[PDB]
Symmetry: D2
Subunit: 255 residues, 4 copies
């Protein structure tokens, strides 16, 4: 099944998670061809400013994600930032996410693999696609069996990322590949207008799933306000990329 990872960037409140979780549950009922995984971060551990929102702590967030899993029967993903966090987070998380800046941190990867959960590694902005083979090898060494690599843009001069779609077939040689539709068009340190066009590209090229952050009111979000998708637009984008995938998939190269 095609994967759709979606949810609000940050756990702003248990209330927010439930509102977004209600809609992702509704769509999971509508789209049985899709495996939905609910995402939200319990900590924004890498914000540019000391004064920006980080979150309500690991305990609160794991609590809130457990409420979503309980209330809606959705799989869960969240990211970890230091090795000690893997074990408590694996209590709720079906997929443990490794942040882009941290994709070379051997102990973090090994900690995630040890839990027995699937692991999804954000490809660092500094990494070449062929450099991800070694990432997967660390995770396999550590006992991971279900491994994803997520395309989320590459450093392109200052304060800009570019998506090199050659990465999708290259990374597919050693893991399942996810396209991150919302961070790929952020300007580190137009953005929203490119989210839909580039996700159409991703599915035309061929990937195993899409990652998209979504918020009932992105203008009021406490992180990535400029690129979270309005919740109301999520259904239309999911239908679109299923249609495009249905047609394009005839042509996906055997890797």
């Amino acid at each position: 099944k095609f994967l759709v990872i979606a949810g609000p960037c940050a756990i702003e409140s248990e209330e927010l998670l439930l509102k977004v979780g209600e809609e992702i549950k509704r769509l999971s009922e509508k789209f049985k061809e899709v495996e939905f995984v609910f995402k939200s971060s319990f900590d924004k551990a890498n914000r540019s400013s000391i004064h920006s929102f980080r979150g309500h702590g690991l305990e609160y967030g794991v609590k809130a994600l457990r409420k979503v899993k309980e209330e809606f029967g959705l799989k869960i993903t969240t990211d970890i930032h230091e090795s000690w966090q893997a074990e408590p987070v694996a209590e709720v998380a079906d997929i443990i996410q490794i942040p882009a800046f941290l994709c070379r941190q051997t102990d973090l990867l090994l900690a995630a693999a040890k839990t027995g959960r699937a692991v999804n590694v954000k490809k660092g902005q500094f990494l070449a696609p062929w450099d991800t083979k070694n990432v997967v090898e660390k995770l396999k060494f550590g006992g991971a069996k279900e491994i994803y690599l997520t395309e989320r843009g590459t450093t392109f001069g200052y304060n800009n990322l570019v998506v090199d779609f050659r990465s999708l077939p290259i990374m597919k040689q050693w893991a399942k590949v996810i396209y991150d539709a919302t961070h790929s068009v952020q300007l580190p340190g137009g953005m929203r207008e490119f989210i839909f066009p580039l996700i159409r590209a991703a599915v035309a090229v061929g990937c195993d799933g899409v990652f998209m952050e979504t918020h009932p009111e992105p203008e009021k979000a406490l992180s990535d306000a400029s690129t979270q998708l309005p919740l109301s637009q999520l259904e239309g984008i999911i239908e679109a990329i299923l249609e495009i995938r249905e047609v394009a998939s005839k042509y996906y190269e055997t890797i």
Copy 2:
């Protein structure tokens, strides 16, 4: 709103080569009636890396060969110019005058093309940001051009590598029709020392991306036997694969098209 397919061998290796590729593009033009085919081939590779590499058989031979394609098959023609004086003789045969990527900022070349009354297609320089094509279009409009295309062909990405930033397609659509160059976009410039290299395995996935994003046409070079080609041997599409790739293009365009944003 017929989709454009610009296709042909990179260089005019001979009139015979042209007529062989021409016969296949004519055949495809009769099948894919919803496409506007334009036959491309360069009378001069004016910018090769090496003094030792094939350039061509001269402007007169090239125009004569292109004219034989138009006459025999009724195909529209495009070829590229390198200095202002070439615009007039080339306009005698070319429906679309192409402006090379390195020359996209040369005012006199742009004006020379524009005053011919022919359509003009500018290759976006590897050094240009997509928003800086607005002034390129302005120069052409100033010079009298009424039908203008901008072609995406990759951007300098460190040394001997190009990346395609697909954000460029909706940005450039604000002020011209947009073409995606499927075969130069995956070349590795200078990558072979005295020539450039390239990665044929990425041509098709990236053309699928281009039409899913949305463009007004594609550009793709094709040769009966690319490995024997005298230029871009690493990226030209085998002629036998052209049909299947055009069919895939059209299928993906159709299913994506309801989602194309109004620009």
Copy 3:
């Protein structure tokens, strides 16, 4: 305004290695009295490309080895931390706590270093623009740091390549002391597949550039026999060359210094 030279072997391969390099840095510290020497070595290569590559002998062994250098030679010490819990034990020996390039945005790591009361040196991430180091310094100041350095170590430039943008030196000088990393700046990340490569021939020319532009110090890894090193074998400076390079540094700094702009 003593110039800083941070130097030592990339990784703590053994206590014996450290003491061998230490004896030479001590000797140079007695010659170049106008320099503040700081001995560097990593107790863990926490970010190697390959699971098969050398990481080290553990935090306890490493701190003990660094302490033996400080005790035997009276040298200041720096080493890098990878997770917040390491700041406290490391601060027991380290005069300067180093923040790795990939971790330069990790708030908790920065705060952990800052509350120790030690100086903090942050490697500028390969993904960061020079002006985005202002917020890094702000986090450190917020956390209690009073002595802060920013180290230039190259920027991602296409795949498997770094470039040094020397504009970064005057930009970063606006809000911290600036160090130039002469040996990681010429590495080719991942360039050897399962390891990174590098170009030793460019270390010296680029260090000459750094001091002509103006910086507050340099960072350079050195090994008696780099080709046998367990990490960065391609970029570590042979120990025998360290003296001549420091002398050249100081000479070029002196003649350039009247021209350094007030920031």
Copy 4:
């Protein structure tokens, strides 16, 4: 002798050339260790806008450059844009300049080489340093004997250039190398503040000369207003980089 190529970006008027030529003559009398070459463009053939200043034509410009050579006994350089221009320009120009965008145009290179003048090729923003070996080979094929390559920055994302100082020793393997101090810090499509620091770098690394545009009043210049050096600052910068060169040159590697 170390080369200093200097002059106003564009031939705004014969009057301007004479004012700048007066100062470059004065400095050539002060610095006998230096070979001065006077530069100014008779055409800005590649401006971003159709409405920007190009110049007064080839005839006027070659006239004005001849006045400078006559009045002050200075060597001359100017750039050419199409092959036909090489012969008339070689009447006045000791060094024929090949523009950065045009560095792969075989006929332009061959036209310049045919004149018997020295040729200076601006390294394209798209070119890798090792790619310039083939440029020199074209010029040698065409009969050129005195060949320079000029470092003027490399495309670094959008609307930005970076100077990779590794280029200086690489290009030195096959030609004399010049550093362009003023276009290297322009933002295509802070700038002036980086001119002096990067020229100090260039001479610390080692080059055969520097190229710097200069104008009595850069704020009023009709091209590259943001990066031409005020004429009054030229003497101090020349003295500085001679001092740095004197010391650093002990360490220049044999290439």
